[PDB]
Amino acid sequence: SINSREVLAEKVKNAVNNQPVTDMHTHLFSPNFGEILLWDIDELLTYHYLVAEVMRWTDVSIEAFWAMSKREQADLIWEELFIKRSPVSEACRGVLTCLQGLGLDPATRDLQVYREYFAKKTSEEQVDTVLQLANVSDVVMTNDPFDDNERISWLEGKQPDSRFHAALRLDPLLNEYEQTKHRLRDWGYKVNDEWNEGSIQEVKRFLTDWIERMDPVYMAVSLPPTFSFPEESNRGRIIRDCLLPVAEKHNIPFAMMIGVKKRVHPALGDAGDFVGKASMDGVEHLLREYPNNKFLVTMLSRENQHELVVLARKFSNLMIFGCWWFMNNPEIINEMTRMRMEMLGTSFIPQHSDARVLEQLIYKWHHSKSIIAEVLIDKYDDILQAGWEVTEEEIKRDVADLFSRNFWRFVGR
């Protein structure tokens, strides 16, 4: 039986380590979609998190950086962030965890040798390897139909294998309708100059056509710190007249990733986004006024985290998830996961990888699981010491909810 923190620690760590993970938000693609799925050490080293970091150290111009080849970029970052300075940051640590996880030894710092490993392997094989090592059963993608490369694949019949699931990303439609409406009409969606019945129906038709083609687990959008709802704006009316009705009809949840301030430093590309605290008014209104709609929410500002948890206490149709981006750091992952558990028990989704490069699934889940395991150990021990019987079976059940079941139960699949 489990009758001590010591015994508990072992059981929790084992259960957490063995629980197959459903990664509900990533930037990975089923291997059959082609090169859009990024992988290998050079891709790991050029993750935009490391681009931002290297630029704080290197005298190499950002324009010169983008001009270099992928290998040149990787060599520079490795040299600047691993050799000239110890790789102690979270993103650098992550690269190391991946290498070790694949059987490569960071002790040698032999980059040329690490590279050879990847060269003698295919995309399909590396996917098998990584999913096995990271113990990830299901990966949810981010599918942007407004991206020409991504859109052509779906239109031409490309479909993910069983391990990969689609999520209809809609940032251009909701946040740039003034420019995006012209593309809809180019694709046959007769949206008019004014927001009338015709415009509302065509936008709904656009969403329905893409839902049928992708069979998404949810529709998503990243939003700025200034997000508000209700709102007399293109976004406010599209959400009110089109997105919500369609989502309820198909019982598809609406995922909102709030707090991103896009391109405060354009020259840095994907690495040029900032953060800002948002008002909870919009989320609060959406949850209260649309009780038949489901909402998946994650916020970027550290200062929004505690109140988001309290908001989940208020509305069952709100399912909070992950420690997103700038929140995806040990210090923050820990505080967020503890506040969440203390006020929500196990009724939340503690994490997602947001993996942009295949191998990251290894470090993202290993770094997170160790922290989540420690929180669970503290929480289980507190009730154990209080006289409660905790069985290994109940631990596996709870761990399964946190890393997989809660999501699937919420999406309705």
Ligand X SMILES: O=C[C@H](O)[C@@H](O)[C@H](O)[C@H](O)C(=O)O
Binding residues: 25, 27, 331, 354
Please tell me the distance from the alpha carbon of residue 77 to that of residue 69, in angstroms, as a whole number: 12
Shortest Cβ 354–Zn ion spacing (Å) = 4
Q: Which listed option, its own copies, Zn ion, ligand X, none, makes contact with residue 325 (CB within 5 to 8 Å by class)?
A: ligand X
CB neighbours of residue 412 within 10 Å: 12
Q: Which listed option, its own copies, ligand X, Zn ion, none, makes contact with residue 379 (CB within 5 to 8 Å by class)?
A: none
User: Would you count residue 274 as binding ligand X (CB under 6 A)?
Assistant: no
Please tell me the distance from the alpha carbon of residue 219 to that of residue 142, in angstroms, as a whole number: 9
Indicate the annotated binding residues for Mg(2+): 331
Task: State which residue, 243 or 399, has the beta carbon closest to ligand X.
Answer: 243
Shortest Cβ 146–ligand X spacing (Å) = 13
Task: State which residue, 159 or 346, has the beta carbon closest to its own copies.
Answer: 159
Please tell me the distance from the alpha carbon of residue 323 to that of residue 341, in angstroms, as a whole number: 14
Q: Which listed option, ligand X, Zn ion, its own copies, none, makes contact with residue 305 (CB within 5 to 8 Å by class)?
A: none
3-state secondary structure of 413: coil
Q: Looking at 257, 258, 333, 402, which residue binds ligand X (CB under 6 A)?
A: 257
Backbone angles phi and psi of 73, in degrees to 5 = -65, -45
User: Would you count residue 73 as binding ligand X (CB under 6 A)?
Assistant: no
Sheet holding 136-140, edge to edge: 21-23, 136-140, 164-165
Please tell me the distance from the alpha carbon of residue 82 to that of residue 342, in angstroms, as a whole number: 38
CB neighbours of residue 78 within 10 Å: 22
User: Would you count residue 138 as binding Zn ion (CB under 5 A)?
Assistant: no
User: Would you count residue 401 as binding Zn ion (CB under 5 A)?
Assistant: no
Indicate the annotated binding residues for Zn(2+): 25, 27, 331, 354
Question: 194, 193, 197, 173: which is closest to 184 by C-alpha?
Answer: 173
Helix (H) or strand (E) holding 367: helix 360-385
> Total residues contacting ligand X (rule CB under 6 A)?
8
User: Would you count residue 14 as binding its own copies (CB under 8 A)?
Assistant: no
Q: Which listed option, ligand X, its own copies, Zn ion, none, makes contact with residue 197 (CB within 5 to 8 Å by class)?
A: its own copies
User: Would you count residue 162 as binding its own copies (CB under 8 A)?
Assistant: yes
Q: Which listed option, its own copies, Zn ion, ligand X, none, makes contact with residue 63 (CB within 5 to 8 Å by class)?
A: none
Q: Hey, which residues between 220 and 279 contact its own copies (CB under 8 A)?
A: 245
Q: Which stretch binds its own copies (CB under 8 A): 58-66, 111-119, 155-163, 209-217?
A: 155-163
Three-class HEC string of 201-234:
HHHHHHHHHHHHHHCCCCEEEEECCCCCCCCCCH
Q: Which listed option, Zn ion, its own copies, ligand X, none, makes contact with residue 161 (CB within 5 to 8 Å by class)?
A: its own copies
Please tell me the distance from the alpha carbon of residue 104 to that of residue 350, in angstroms, as a whole number: 29
CB 181 within 8 A of CB 192: no
Q: Which two tokens stand for residue 295?
A: 């909402």
User: Would you count residue 270 as binding ligand X (CB under 6 A)?
Assistant: yes
Q: Looking at 53, 171, 354, 381, which residue binds Zn ion (CB under 5 A)?
A: 354
- Greatest distance between any 2 Cα atoms in the chain: 69
Beta bridge partner(s), residue 220: 169, 255
Q: Looking at 42, 138, 354, 381, which residue binds ligand X (CB under 6 A)?
A: 354
User: Would you count residue 196 as binding its own copies (CB under 8 A)?
Assistant: yes
CB 209 within 8 A of CB 246: no
User: Would you count residue 197 as binding its own copies (CB under 8 A)?
Assistant: yes
Q: Would you give the distance in Å from CA 305 to the centre of its chain?
A: 16
Q: Which stretch binds its own copies (CB under 8 A): 159-167, 300-308, 348-356, 388-396?
A: 159-167
CB 355 within 8 A of CB 141: no
Helices 123-133 and 360-385, axial angle in degrees (round to 10) = 10
Q: Looking at 46, 199, 222, 304, which residue binds ligand X (CB under 6 A)?
A: 222
Residues that bind ligand X (CB under 6 A): 27, 142, 222, 257, 270, 325, 354, 356
**Binding residues vs Zn ion (CB under 5 A):** 354
Q: Name the residues that contact its own copies, by CB under 8 A.
A: 128, 159, 161-162, 196-197, 201, 245
